[PDB]
Design a protein around this ligand. Structure first.
Ligand SMILES: Nc1ncnc2c1ncn2[C@@H]1O[C@H](COP(=O)(O)OP(=O)(O)O)[C@@H](O)[C@H]1O
Ligand SMILES: Nc1ncnc2c1ncn2[C@@H]1O[C@H](COP(=O)(O)OP(=O)(O)O)[C@@H](O)[C@H]1O
Ligand SMILES: Nc1ncnc2c1ncn2[C@@H]1O[C@H](COP(=O)(O)OP(=O)(O)O)[C@@H](O)[C@H]1O
Lengths: 154, 449, 439, 35, 459, 66
């Protein structure tokens, strides 16, 4: 929730809200200096101080989720929610370490999408050719896979 | 996969006409209690309830909380059920009536549809635009931005407040980071570097995700299950938004505070505004106070006004006491520990002791529940201990007697294993007899009296 | 050092029959309670059966804590074993019931497994770009093994670790990519002769072979209390060490139980159930028992083993007596194991074990006199006499202790059986419940 | 490079580069440029 | 600035000033009238055995009781042990009425006092460059980087101590120190070795008059070395490690700069932290760096601890790292403070009493009080005739021991006011009526103070 | 030295047409009103005002807990 505010219909109430509930001195003291202030403090002829001398926000003690509550699914649970996918992962790691290059075939293009993700996570290079892929683009993609050995999966 | 003390209970086991059929779905016998619990369950599932008192009397070892788990597995998952004890409410931060009301509003649920407005893009150009800042001590202040989000189909180039910029800034969003500005609070979680900047020669251990497909201004609806106590805690200690009270209020340590009457009425009016818009659905529930005799008189005084509310869940009290003295004032004795004024609200359900064949059926169910198979003479031996000593003593002589069976290469448990486990592991009565007999005088080989 | 339970090296029973050996692994001289504790240990190592209660009752100085430490040494450093004393619960920060709930949830280990990515190799060059008066940093790290030659990039935290470590050119470092720690292993070149404030010449290691990006699968075990504290607070972490946790509401526990069940089903985590040992439970009042009896009702309760000393005692916070100071609605749930007082042919070998542990050599006449003293004053006086006679024999420069040293120690340090008489003789120069005089 | 100072350390030695735009500033007083 | 006074550097007389040690032989047999004590043979022999147990590092959680009535010498034996062990072994003399706090549970101040009673000695090295800066002269590199301006390969600093100066070549990444800390010519700095980032201490005193008003601290030249390679012994109690790991001292944020700015609160410490610190201290001992030294926790007035504390003491004494617990009880059959049920000896529960090596303490003979009077009189410097000694011994036998040691100060004051140098019988016979004991006070209180009236006490 | 903004004067009222201020008329009195006030202070208020900063610049008190 946001904090409770006062519905008082004067201008002074709005000014006091935006000077207490926001209060830009503490915000400036907490987050740090404006880059304009950094430029005028670092191109000057003499050293000058800064009123937030560094960013006084504390370092968050949880790396993946800091100061919010907004989380997202985890590619981890993705690779394990499918038995096939979990077994494909093992096999692709071994194939890669062997320097093998894979054509990987599917009967569903929706799955082709899901996977496309997974491959991004494990950061493998891939191409795609399906019935959506336009004809000269087909020629192009197939030629790549065949020209440039960086691509691991098609 | 752990067999607790209450694992065989899978429900009340009632017929279509509400008649309890014995030895069904875990229970053995106990007719007049299970029919009344079925009546209580259908009182819960009819929503004409704004506070009813249901007492579960009966001695210890007769299955008062087995009925409670039967109710909690008969209601379902989507109905709130808050089990507490009588010792849980003595806190050190707040008064105990606050803990009572927090449990009462844990026991009321709400199912709300929400429409989140995400802006899910990949940051292209991030450039601050400060405003005028005269001599006022703090110096310059960034007041306007020009962050360009780039989704898969149609980019957008939007302008921000100072507060949403600070939300960005406390997330360390560089150029290339995909984010998702949540325009309900203002929060914005960095997801990772976009795959257009992908490089296997990297060290930061970043999570590379592709460009989010679809429109950059999405809009998605979800369903949420929120109790009223969650709304009380949300409006009490604010942890949403991008101002200072709701940011310096999540660095401090969290303390239970006393949510007053005015907030508990205003959130009721807000929830009624949700229901009148055809969005939220109210689902009241159960507060199961086990061991109610530990509550003192200052709590039974406040339960009167807590049940007089137009919105209040049904209370199910358990009390294994006879004529006893109330904890608060030590000069009036009453049945069950309940004061004689509060006792009139209650629909008192009795619970009767068992029989030498019902003990045999419970032993058989518990043995086939834990996974210990045995012979009928051993079942008769354990039932003999159940008649003589206790009910929940003879159930606990099955777990060593399995292990001892596996010592002697057996699979089923015979008479010898229980005849040895009755000698290794003792009950309370024979231990007190050994205590009184051997502990004659205090000294070196005595007991501290 | 040598504490009062350092000679114990486990429980000392068989693995196939679990019969109590009369002399094995320190715990020497008792058979019934050690066999019953072996059965309890086996049903803890099974891990299936949840929510029991074992009450090791008996006279004092009979080895109850010795049996508890025997089970503790027999589980190893895998299963949690909380050595809770019953007086720690009465806090002033948090409530009396929530301290019990934390004491239960500290004894359910969660064992998770995660993949980290470790590096290895010789640093070729560092490249750090720094701003002036506050600002970001830029970093390029060229690292080389015998095979690969990589030019990696760096962020702010990696440079803050490099400058903390002072990683120069020619160091064998290993960077965990996930956690982000830097451990210098040594050097391959020598120390330069151009700069002064360089440091200490480290170990001479060669260039590592293999690959740069190696993977590692580490196993991390956290109790449920640590998960409760790290998921109950937004920024206020580290309060699970400094005890600053005020209260954890029930909405947090009812979510963490469900997520641990989901982690159990996914094959991510494994629940290792543990032991909560409560030493001298007779100090808890009835407000604690009215919660302990109901916390042993769920799938996440540890198998409670607890001790006692008292006969018919009155329960604290009440007005009436009971055996062991425990209420008779709680004594139905428990299972009581008795211990017996010792025999002198067992006290002899117990004092022999305690003497061989503290590196004290004896004569059989002194051991016979010591056993005669231990018959009348217990082990707790006899072991102190062992150590004291060792040092008195060290003062008069004798090799082995003798009868005279034991008589000297018996003359100097009273056993309680003579201090009671010393109280009862001079009652006028000791403050009773009344006045006192001075000669 | 505008306001960033480079440090590079190789097997031979270790040197520090300063951009020309910072020599007139107060940052060059240590490096021997100054105002 | 601060003006030094050239007066006499004496000391003050406490009640245990004359105690200087146990006064034993080389065999452990006590000897009467030695090092302050008079008599009390077996107690001093037993305390010598305790001192030997402490210095032999075989004590790992023992417990010693000191029985005996009030005013017989338990605290005297405690200070004798503390002065016999020395100074480099810790000694934490808490009382029984000092565990009761209002921020933590009372079974926690006990554990913090255990950790105060244990010491840890760490031997390390200290390598610093030191002194006042004379030059900051850079050096141009041999191969400048293309696209930049200056390229500096080695930065030269001339450091001048108070004994000798020295030129220093350094890696150029000292510049980030010098710009951030504002180091100039004439500012003492120290350069460490493990990292190498100089931190200014202050402007030197030789440049304290180049300006007139622009002042800061003017620290002097470091009167010592310029290249310290000095080794350090360092004593840290484990309480200090518990505090520094629980509540960190110096951070760089807002909320830890409010934590040291608001009041420090005692907080209870979780047992995983103590287990980890013990597991790592026992590892650094096995590496052969740190020495563990156990001390004494003299819990005076042990009958003020209630029954909830001895239960925690049983757990704490069974720990593998624990000091000795010298209790001090002066009660007979007493009611334990917590449980008002059992009347036990000494105020100690019968379960806890079996752990304790009980040392007795006997009353004093009527010809040893006068020897204590002679030692106390030659301790304070108050000299007095022999008939005065016999009269003070008469008051000591007939009334109290602590009362005959307190008729020496007003007798000396009345002596040097009356016009003498030594105390006679008349001054003590006059000072015995200005300072009544407890006995004649109770006699006046009962006899003259009959009942509550106008000129009467308030019963 | 205490100052309060009462509002925007009604001569500059219809400069724009939907500005958001509190349009008040110009005061039809003096500009310099001189009045005297006798007023009491208790010493406990001196004690509180000298111990802790009160009211004016005490903006961190909006947290509430400690
Ligand atoms: N009707 C029943 N069928 C099967 N088991 C029962 C029944 N009644 C009681 N029990 C057993 O009794 C044990 C304790 O019951 P519980 O409800 O804890 O007793 P109390 O009513 O004293 O709380 C439980 O383990 C349960 O298995
Ligand atoms: N059976 C035994 N084997 C080995 N040591 C024992 C045995 N019984 C007692 N002891 C020793 O005697 C001491 C007292 O045992 P402990 O369990 O502390 O007694 P209590 O149960 O009264 O606290 C312990 O230090 C232990 O070393
Ligand atoms: N053996 C002794 N020799 C000299 N002075 C003593 C001796 N024993 C006690 N005293 C003196 O007696 C005084 C009171 O003894 P004290 O230590 O207070 O007794 P307790 O230890 O019972 O409190 C102390 O000031 C001490 O100086």
């Amino acid at each position: 929730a946001p904090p409770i505010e006062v519905v008082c219909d004067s201008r002074s109430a709005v000014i006091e809200r935006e000077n207490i509930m926001f209060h830009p001195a503490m915000r400036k003291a907490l987050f740090g200096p404006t880059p304009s202030e950094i430029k005028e403090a670092s191109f000057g002829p003499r050293p000058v101080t800064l009123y937030p001398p560094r960013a006084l926000l504390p370092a968050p003690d949880h790396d993946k989720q800091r100061f919010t509550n907004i989380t997202v699914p985890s590619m981890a649970r993705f690779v394990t929610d499918s038995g096939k996918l979990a077994k494909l992962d093992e096999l692709l790691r071994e194939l890669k370490e062997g320097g093998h290059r894979v054509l990987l075939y599917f009967q569903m293009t929706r799955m082709i999408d899901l996977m496309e993700e997974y491959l991004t996570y494990r950061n493998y290079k891939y191409c795609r050719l399906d019935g959506s892929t336009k004809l000269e683009d087909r020629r192009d993609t197939v030629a790549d896979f065949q020209t440039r050995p960086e691509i691991f999966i098609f | 996969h752990r067999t607790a003390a209450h694992t065989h209970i899978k429900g009340l086991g009632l017929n279509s006409s509400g008649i309890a059929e014995k030895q069904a779905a875990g229970f053995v016998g106990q007719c007049a209690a299970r029919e009344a619990c079925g009546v209580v369950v259908d009182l819960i599932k009819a929503h004409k309830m704004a506070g009813r008192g249901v007492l579960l009397a009966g001695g210890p070892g007769t299955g008062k909380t087995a009925l409670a788990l039967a109710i909690s597995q008969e209601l379902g998952t989507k109905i709130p059920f808050c089990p507490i004890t009588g010792s849980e409410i003595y806190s050190t931060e707040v008064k105990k009536t606050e803990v009572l009301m927090e449990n009462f509003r844990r026991a009321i649920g709400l199912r709300v549809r929400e429409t989140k407005d995400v802006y899910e893009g990949e940051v292209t150009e991030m450039t601050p635009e400060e405003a005028e800042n005269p001599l006022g001590g703090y110096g310059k202040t960034i007041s306007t931005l020009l962050i360009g989000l780039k989704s898969a189909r149609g980019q957008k180039k939007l302008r921000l407040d100072p507060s949403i910029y600070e939300a960005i800034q406390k997330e360390r969003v560089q150029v290339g980071d995909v984010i998702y500005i949540e325009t309900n609070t203002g929060a914005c979680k960095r997801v990772g570097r976009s795959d257009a900047y992908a490089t296997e020669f990297d060290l930061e251990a970043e999570e590379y995700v592709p460009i989010p497909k679809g429109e950059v201004h999405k809009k998605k609806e979800i369903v949420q299950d929120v109790t009223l106590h969650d709304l009380d805690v949300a409006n009490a200690r604010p942890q949403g938004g991008q101002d200072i009270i709701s940011m310096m209020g999540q660095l401090m340590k969290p303390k239970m505070t006393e949510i007053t009457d005015k907030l508990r009425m205003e959130i009721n009016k807000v929830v009624q505004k949700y229901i009148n818009q055809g969005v939220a659905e109210l689902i009241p529930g159960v507060l199961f106070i086990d061991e109610a005799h530990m509550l003192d008189i200052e709590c039974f005084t406040y339960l009167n006004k807590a049940l007089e509310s137009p919105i209040a869940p049904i209370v199910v009290l358990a009390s294994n006491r006879g004529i006893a003295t109330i904890r608060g004032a030590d000069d009036l004795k009453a049945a069950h520990g309940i004061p004689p004024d509060f006792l009139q609200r209650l629909l008192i359900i009795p619970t009767h002791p068992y029989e030498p064949d019902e003990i045999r059926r419970i032993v058989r169910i518990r043995a086939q529940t834990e996974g210990v198979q045995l012979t009928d003479a051993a079942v008769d031996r354990v039932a003999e201990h159940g008649v003589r000593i206790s009910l929940r003593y003879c159930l606990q002589l099955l777990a060593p007697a399995s292990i001892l069976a596996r010592v002697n290469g057996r699979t089923q448990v015979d008479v010898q294993d229980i005849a040895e486990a009755e000698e290794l592991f003792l009950d309370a009565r024979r231990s007190a007899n050994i205590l009184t007999s051997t502990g004659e005088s205090g000294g070196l080989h005595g007991f501290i009296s | 050092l040598i504490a009062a339970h350092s000679h114990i090296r486990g429980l000392g029973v068989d693995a196939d029959t679990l019969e109590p050996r009369p002399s094995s692994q320190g715990l020497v001289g008792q058979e019934k309670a050690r066999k019953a504790a072996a059965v309890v240990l086996e049903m803890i190592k099974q891990g299936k059966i949840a929510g029991r209660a074992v009450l090791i009752a008996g006279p004092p100085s009979t080895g109850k804590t010795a049996i508890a430490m025997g089970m503790a040494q027999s589980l190893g450093q895998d299963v949690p074993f909380t050595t809770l004393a019953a007086s720690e619960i009465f806090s002033l920060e948090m409530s009396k019931t929530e301290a019990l709930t934390q004491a239960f949830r500290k004894s359910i280990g969660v064992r998770i497994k995660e993949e980290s990515e470790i590096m290895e190799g010789e640093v070729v060059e560092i490249q750090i770009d720094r701003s002036v008066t506050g600002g970001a940093k830029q970093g390029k790290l060229t690292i080389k093994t015998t095979d690969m030659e990589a030019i990696y990039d760096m962020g702010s935290k990696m440079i803050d670790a490099m400058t903390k470590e002072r990683v120069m050119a020619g160091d064998i470092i290993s960077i965990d990519k996930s956690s982000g720690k830097i451990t210098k292993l040594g050097r391959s070149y020598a120390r330069s002769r151009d700069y002064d404030a360089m440091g200490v010449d480290t170990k001479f290691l060669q260039c590592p072979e293999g690959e740069l990006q190696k993977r590692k699968e580490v196993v991390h075990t956290v109790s449920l209390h640590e998960i409760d504290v790290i998921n109950s607070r937004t920024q206020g972490f580290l309060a699970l060490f400094s005890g600053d946790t005020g209260e954890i509401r029930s909405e947090i526990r009812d979510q963490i139980n469900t997520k641990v069940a989901e982690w159990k089903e996914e094959g991510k985590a494994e629940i290792v159930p543990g032991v909560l040992f409560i030493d001298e439970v007779h100090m808890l009042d009835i407000e604690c028992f009215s919660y302990i009896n109901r916390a042993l009702e769920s799938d996440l309760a540890p198998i409670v083993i607890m001790a006692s000393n008292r006969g018919v005692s009155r329960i604290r916070g009440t007005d009436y007596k009971s055996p062991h100071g425990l209420p008779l609605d709680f004594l139905d749930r428990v299972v009581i194991i008795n211990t017996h007082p010792y025999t002198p042919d067992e006290l002899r070998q117990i004092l022999s074990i305690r003497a061989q542990e503290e590196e004290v050599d004896l004569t059989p006449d002194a051991l016979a006199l010591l056993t005669k003293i231990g018959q009348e004053a217990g082990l707790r006086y006899a072991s102190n006499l062992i150590t004291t006679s060792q040092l008195i024999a060290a003062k008069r420069r004798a090799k082995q202790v003798g009868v005279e040293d034991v008589q000297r120690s018996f003359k100097l340090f009273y056993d309680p059986a003579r201090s009671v008489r010393f109280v009862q003789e001079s009652e006028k120069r000791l403050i009773g419940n009344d006045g006192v005089v001075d000669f | 490079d505008p306001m960033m100072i480079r440090w590079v350390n190789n097997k031979m030695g270790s040197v520090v580069a300063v951009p020309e735009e910072l020599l007139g500033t107060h940052a060059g007083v240590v490096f021997g440029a100054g105002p």
